[PDB]
Structure 1
Amino acid sequence: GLEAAVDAAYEILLEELEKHGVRTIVVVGTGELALVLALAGVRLARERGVKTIVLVRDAAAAHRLLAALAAALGLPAPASADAAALAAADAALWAEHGLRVRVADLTDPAALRAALEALFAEHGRDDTLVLPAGEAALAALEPVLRELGLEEMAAVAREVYARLRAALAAARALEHHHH
Structure 2
Amino acid sequence: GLEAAVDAAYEILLEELEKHGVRTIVVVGTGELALVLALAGVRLARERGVKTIVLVRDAAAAHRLLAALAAALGLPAPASADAAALAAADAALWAEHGLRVRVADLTDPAALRAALEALFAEHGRDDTLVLPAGEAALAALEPVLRELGLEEMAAVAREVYARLRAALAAARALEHHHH
- Scaled to the shorter chain, the TM-score interval is over 0.9
**TM-score with structure 1 length normalisation?**
1.00
Offset of residue 60 of structure 1: 0.0
Q: CA deviation at 1:173?
A: 0.0
TM-score scaled by length of structure 2: 1.00
User: What CA deviation, in whole Å up to 9, does each residue of 1:8-62 have, x standing for no partner?
Assistant: 0000000000000000000000000000000000000000000000000000000
C-alpha distance in structure 1 between counterparts of 2:161 and 2:143, whole Å: 16
SS of residue paired to 2:142: helix
> What value does the CA root-mean-square deviation take over the aligned residues?
0.0
Q: Does 1:20 align with 2:23?
A: no
- Paired with 2:72 and 2:121, the residues of 1 have a C-alpha distance of 30
Q: Return the alpha-carbon distance in structure 2 between the equivalents of residues 99 and 168 of structure 1.
A: 21
**1:135 CA displacement:** 0.0
Q: State the 1:111 CA deviation.
A: 0.0
Residue number in structure 2 paired with 1:64: 64
For residues 5-154 of structure 1, what are the structure 2 equivalents within 5 Å? 5-154=5-154
**Residues in 2 aligned to 1:98 and 1:175: alpha-carbon distance in whole angstroms:** 28
Of all paired residues, the percent bearing the same amino acid is: 100
Q: Could you list the per-position Cα deviations for residues 115-140 of structure 1 after superposition, in whole angstroms to 9, with x for gaps in the alignment?
A: 00000000000000000000000000
Query: For 1:28 and 1:103, how far apart are their aligned partners in 2?
Result: 10
How far apart are 1:92 and its partner, in Å? 0.0
Q: Secondary structure at the match of 1:107?
A: coil
Question: 1:52-77 CA distances to partner (integer Å, 9 max, x unpaired)?
Answer: 00000000000000000000000000
Give unmatched runs, 5+ long, in structure 1.
none
Deviation at 1:95, TM superposition (A): 0.0
SS in 2 for 1:79: coil
- Distance in structure 2 (CA, Å) of the matches to 1:39 and 1:146: 28
Report the CA distance between 1:97 and its aligned residue.
Answer: 0.0
* Offset at residue 80 of structure 1 (A): 0.0
Q: Residue by residue, what CA displacement relative to the aligned partner does 1:75-102 show, whole Å, maximum 9, x if unpaired?
A: 0000000000000000000000000000
User: Aligned with 1:76: secondary structure?
Assistant: coil
Displacement of 1:148 after TM fit? 0.0
Inter-partner Cα distance in structure 2 for 1:155 and 1:37: 19
Which whole-Å CA distance do the structure 1 matches of 2:177 and 2:58 have between them? Answer: 24
Cα shift at 1:150:
0.0
